[PDB]
Amino acid sequence: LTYYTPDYTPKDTDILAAFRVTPQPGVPFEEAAAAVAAESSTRYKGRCYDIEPVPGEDNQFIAYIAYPLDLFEEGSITNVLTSIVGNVFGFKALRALRLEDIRFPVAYIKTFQGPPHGIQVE
Amino acid sequence: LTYYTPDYTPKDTDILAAFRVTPQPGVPFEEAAAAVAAESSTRYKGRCYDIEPVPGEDNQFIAYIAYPLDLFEEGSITNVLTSIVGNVFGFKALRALRLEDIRFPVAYIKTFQGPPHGIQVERDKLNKYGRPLLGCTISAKNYGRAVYECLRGGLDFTKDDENINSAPFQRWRDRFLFVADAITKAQAETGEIKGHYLNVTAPTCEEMLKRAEYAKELKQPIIMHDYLTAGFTANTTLARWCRDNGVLLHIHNHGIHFRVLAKALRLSGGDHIHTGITMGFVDLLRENYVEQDKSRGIYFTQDWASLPGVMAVASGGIHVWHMPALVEIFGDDSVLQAPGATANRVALEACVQARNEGRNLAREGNDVIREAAKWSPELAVACELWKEIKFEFE
């Protein structure tokens, strides 16, 4: 339960995910989000810092999970898409789970080289 | 005059310089700083945002210039050191100009790869942990016979310094064998693994590629060269020969201060470089985060953001009796310079245990050297040779 600290502001350099979560009956909204931020990774742990709900839809809530910077390899999309959602889609305590967004920092975007050609170079 | 906007906060991602400026008579402090931030570069312009003065010194003022992020090339120290101070040292409107500091952002530090080996990575092949190192400078056979008996006293390595290249009396090939044949006869007979640091300097680099492929074939330890009479361009062809081999890490009023030269040299590479302000950059090569100490030359604040450290080299001279003065100041993670070599290891190893008892090694340093004479005859000779010079004139 040190994987849910809402008393925390995610830093300028953190990697920062969202999740449109839907749990089983009776499962609280605060333990399904600690069932996501902890079983992704393993000061080296993600922490669900916010728990915002969704109005007028089937019982969803928006989980804001904040992984550190150093947790990942510079310039890799396979690592980022696998160390985050490796075995987190495989729970039975959730009815559904989607990954709506990722914030990459400024510090981690410019490790990558990107598209070779752009709106100018084409 | 759009190069001086003090109504501006430099961003989280800006590149950010300082300058200890001194102008000609009558030249204002606000136009000399726009004479720096504009003639460096050319939304694409640096802007001197602050103009702070210096108390009790010859008319200096501290100019804080803020270049954008995109102005520069990712991973280059030659570009950063040249697009900033290209033709800015060449004015006659200034009496002097120094470059005291640079803040790199977090976003631009981790473009670089850095030193190949750190405070952690150095201890793999180097068999020394938690205690600093030792190493002393040295025909062709007779030259090999002398390093044959310096490492046999405790020296963790030795130094082929003072510029020994292939002369007609002592060629380059016949120096490598006789200080490789002199390691194989002191590794097993002393119980530790030692190197002999050897120059790779050649006229070409194709010859320098043969003075570093012959050295470590699989033959030989971690073996270095310089940065002067060479560049951040010359030592990039061979500091990235450590990206295959792990073999070359030691780097041996009006200027650029060394802490700018030390940011340029960690980020380039190398594991222990040669050199409040003496404590200043040695808390930049070794630390992770440094908060702004204006009385230390550390005028900025930048976390290093998880990148390998780099140790320091003792730079005062011969130090045989003045051993516990270095152990506190450079700490654990540094490097220092056969009877005359066995006195070196004993005085080093003794103090470190008298620190860990809790004895104040600053106010007690000489008596720890004196108690280590009663089981070591080579420290019986040295303490009488050095200086007890005092004044009790109160």
Place this chain on the structure above:
Amino acid sequence: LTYYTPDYTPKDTDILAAFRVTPQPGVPFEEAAAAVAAESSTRYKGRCYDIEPVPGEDNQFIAYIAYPLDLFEEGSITNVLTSIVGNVFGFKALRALRLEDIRFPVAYIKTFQGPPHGIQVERDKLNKYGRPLLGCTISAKNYGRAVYECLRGGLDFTKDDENINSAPFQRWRDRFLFVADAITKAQAETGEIKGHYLNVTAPTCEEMLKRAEYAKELKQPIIMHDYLTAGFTANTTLARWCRDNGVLLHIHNHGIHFRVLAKALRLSGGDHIHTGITMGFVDLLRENYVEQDKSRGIYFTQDWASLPGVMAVASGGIHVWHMPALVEIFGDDSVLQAPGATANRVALEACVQARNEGRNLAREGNDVIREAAKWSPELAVACELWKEIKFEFE
């Protein structure tokens, strides 16, 4: 004190240095010079053979130190500049120390290969004979469009100076095409062949090997980089890329004087370097034999013994109206820096014929600029912009 034998003539084959020394108070002139010749090297020792003083200046004396021939490695400038002044600048017994001169022997000059191209060899692909040259410094397309219209006024080349590397707004590849596509549209439309001098500076050298193999594939003229933030080691991997290609020749109180830095740089390589004493090294880069001129900084005598010359670059600034002052001083064999570019070629070409008539171009220089306005409207504008400032206060 066997490092000071004034009873000795330095041989025909010795290496032979000078030093403009300034000691601390009370330090004699005869022990500071033995503090130089001994701590440089270590029959294998340099010997200060002469101790001549300097008249009417702050207590200097000229120390003549003579190292043997065999002490050094054949063909290396890094060794010569490092085994001589390694730890000799680091004394506290001297207030200052400069290195004014070096005599290389005849026997050691012709170990070196030298500049690849000379006063003869430069005129092969460069289509300019018997008259000096011209060249001015300059997004990515809009950057290519500007050199597209500087060479169309008479500029023999242009300069990608002030440190333009690949930034996120202007990459390295998309700058080469648009100033190669801008040469193919000014070679035929002006009747001459022009280059655009481009930087090759990279972080690594493996990237620098791609910024110089892409430039001249067979694409492109003779294209250069620097010596600072780089070495005689960094620019040896690419000055010997001119040993295949002929493509990079322009090099762009207490010190080392430039004439030592100029002996180091002819012998390294390059065809025209950037910079009584202004006349001094420009009679070392260009001459064959120079006799001893103590009032010119030329303290020694060494024939260059048949090795390729190297020209000079104008180093005073913008010079549009001050054209005939440069033509006499640097002579024929030198290099100088679209309406604003057509005024440059006209003022250069005019003076050269008024020299060959016999008119004294020193005492007549401005009137030759004035008669060239009556057929050129771009020199009608420039002469009014520059300075007629005088004093007739007799």
Place this chain on the structure above:
Amino acid sequence: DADEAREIAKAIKDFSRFRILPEGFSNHPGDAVAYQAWKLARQYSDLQERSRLIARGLRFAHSETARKQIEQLL
């Protein structure tokens, strides 16, 4: 944690390296790390930057005279 007690042991090191006690501070390490957190907070001339060093400055300061020196910053 490890790295915060790293620097607290550094801050008590320099506070005890001194031959002189500075103004308003005593021998306790709560005064040591609140002396550096005030000595390095004089240099800001801005209000919303120094409170990063004032919340930590009000986290350690042991004697009441060492509490007043932190209160001058506000």
Place this chain on the structure above:
Amino acid sequence: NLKQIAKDTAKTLQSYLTYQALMTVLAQLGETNPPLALWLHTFSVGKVQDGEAYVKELFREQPDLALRIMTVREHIAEEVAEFLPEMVRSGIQQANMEQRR
């Protein structure tokens, strides 16, 4: 009294100014003439700051260092003894404050 202490101090001052000579002497010959660096500790045992007693022993060998020891003292006694009135008073303000607190 009040006057003889000022000549009493001036005799002690002159001694310490000769110290800064010999530390400047010793820090320079350490690399220039190292044969003349380990023999300067034959004459400076217990009291370094002597002026002529070592020279009376150095006449029977080479005495030339003394005339350099007395020309080091020139540039410091002409540039500290004039600036002395504020340089000693400024440290009084420190040692007034540190003891009052």
Place this chain on the structure above:
Amino acid sequence: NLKQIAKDTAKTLQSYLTYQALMTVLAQLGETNPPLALWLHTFSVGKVQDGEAYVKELFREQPDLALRIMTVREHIAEEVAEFLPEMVRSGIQQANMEQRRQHLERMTHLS
């Protein structure tokens, strides 16, 4: 350099000027309070240098007499220490006349 020297000289003679402080108190208390002089003589032998940092140890056990030692840094440091400029250089000229004579004593022995 020289500012390295001059700042070192600023503390050395200061500690010497705080000794003539303590000696003026020493002769003073041999006449007023001979018990207080015999106890001040007991602490004086303890071989403790650094006169500025010596008076601080006095405030530890005796915070009162350490003010009278400090008192004459305004009062006796004006009749001893501003007289130093005309009383150094005069002695240097004397040493230029005392020791130059013995270059002649050897020369007469060489004569």
